[PDB]
């Protein structure tokens, strides 16, 4: 691990505070602008859709990435939620109601066992099994997110290789000739402090850069800064052009 | 199957000639600017890296997408070829020497049986074991490419699902919030007519558009037209913005 306080300039310029954590897989070396916040555990919010997907797929709650989960007919306040989804689009649009149904079908017993198997955060599912990642007891730090994502990247989580490959496909966010980003956003609003998450990794030709960022998110107006600030760090470090 | 000759304007504007074939998976509907050329069989060239990858993986010639195939030290005309590669980068940069090694390991007997099992093109491997897809007897039409790609997309090829998932991952070319393109370029230069290929599919939120295009390619200078003309068709059909 190494601290680079120059990345704070990317938070200060947008009048925000947070942490970006990078992990160079080839060098087995990590970097961050705030090592203490890098190890501070927060609610994972919708970044929990990564382990949730893995568990649901491995248990057969989700058959594959094509299975359609019908809209339940309740009109909610994000338009993308009021439609049918598969695993790919439910993750892409952070469709909480779809994943709440996953968690209910997983059940608390299997959810707790799998999170312990995953070594995921504090492994605590206090609260409702269908909302504990938004207002329950689960807590995870950016470094714990990287450690979890690293296992997922190497297919070393205690689930089938197939489940891990499907979830890594579902995490696909952006890709061109220069890089591939597999990642998941998070927005924790039910319990203070309100924060935004972005966790994942950048695949290059000859290396992988794991990243986990969170930042204070008092309003929804700064949600785009999760990707913007992370990308500025990635560009400064010559990871992406 | 419906013919739309208005797409010829995209070929004519670049003083080019070729065919684009689209398959709407949801509607089970096919479209092309030239029905006859859509069913004319050409050398697959480097689009054969899709079945070649699947066979190498299923036979254990390639263990996974991380296995490094070290540069043999011979400096070739393509700069990106003169380095170590894995399955991902070898597909991305169409590293023929890496796949010629795969084909030599597969051998004629297993290659022929697998292509027969794949129902791939004319299923004929006549010629050299490590170059038949560039100057041998194998031929495939644009519609036969789509028929093959649909099987791959649905994990219905005879090989393991894992092999098909690894290859679909390697086919990743481009992705954003609007669409995902999994595809493979090809350039057939050894036997006339010299043609460029681009085959794959466009993943949308609620549909998948399979595509297979080829076009006359007298020099490498116009290889960018493969993606450019295809995207103009995709834009015209309101598939990508
Ligand atoms: O009920 C909750 O707690 C909750 C509600 C909405 C979101 C959400 C919806 C769409 C995008 C995003 C984003 O992070 O961009 C977040 C997250 C959580
Ligand atoms: O020896 C042959 O026949 C051969 C040689 C090179 C290529 C090639 C190299 C890089 C990109 C592309 C492309 O299609 O963009 C093609 C293909 C075939
Ligand atoms: Cl992918
Ligand atoms: Na991956
Ligand atoms: Na090619």
UniProtKB/Swiss-Prot annotation, chains A, B:
A single MF term (Gene Ontology): beta-lactamase activity
Domain of life assignment: Bacteria
Resulting phenotype, residue 165 to A: No significant effect on catalytic efficiency with respect to ampicillin. Very little reduction in dimerization at neutral pH. Predominantly monomer at neutral pH. Slightly decreases thermal stability
Key word DNA damage present: no
Residues given in the record as a beta-lactam binding sites: 46, 49, 94, 226
Annotated catalysed reactions: a beta-lactam + H2O = a substituted beta-amino acid
Gene Ontology biological process terms, A to Z: antibiotic catabolic process; cell wall organization; response to antibiotic
Induction annotation: Expressed from an upstream promoter, P(out), in an insertion sequence IS1999.
Enzyme Commission designation: 3.5.2.6
Residues at the active site: 46 (acyl-ester intermediate)
Entry keyword set: Antibiotic resistance, Hydrolase, Plasmid, Signal
Residues modified as N6-carboxylysine: 49
Post-translation changes: Carboxylated on the epsilon-amino group of a lysine, with the resulting carbamate functional group serving as a general base. Probably N-carboxylated at Lys-49 at neutral pH in vivo and undergoes complete N-decarboxylation, at pH 4.1, in vitro.
Phenotype for residue 182 to A: No significant effect on catalytic efficiency with respect to ampicillin, nitrocefin or imipenem. Very little reduction in dimerization at neutral pH. Predominantly monomer at neutral pH. Slightly decreases thermal stability
SUPFAM superfamilies recorded: beta-lactamase/transpeptidase-like
Note in the entry: When OXA-48 is present in clinical isolates of K.pneumoniae, increasing chloride concentration during antibiotic treatment reduces bacterial growth.
Annotated function: Class D beta-lactamase which confers resistance to the beta-lactam antibiotics, including amoxicillin, and moderate resistance to cephalosporins and carbapenems such as cephalothin and imipenem; in the DH10B strain of E.coli. Acts via hydrolysis of the beta-lactam ring. Has oxacillin-, cephalothin- and imipenem-hydrolyzing activities.
Annotated family: Belongs to the class-D beta-lactamase family.
UniProt subunit comment: Monomer. Dimer.
Protein's UniProt name: Beta-lactamase OXA-48
Gene that this polypeptide is encoded by: OXA-48
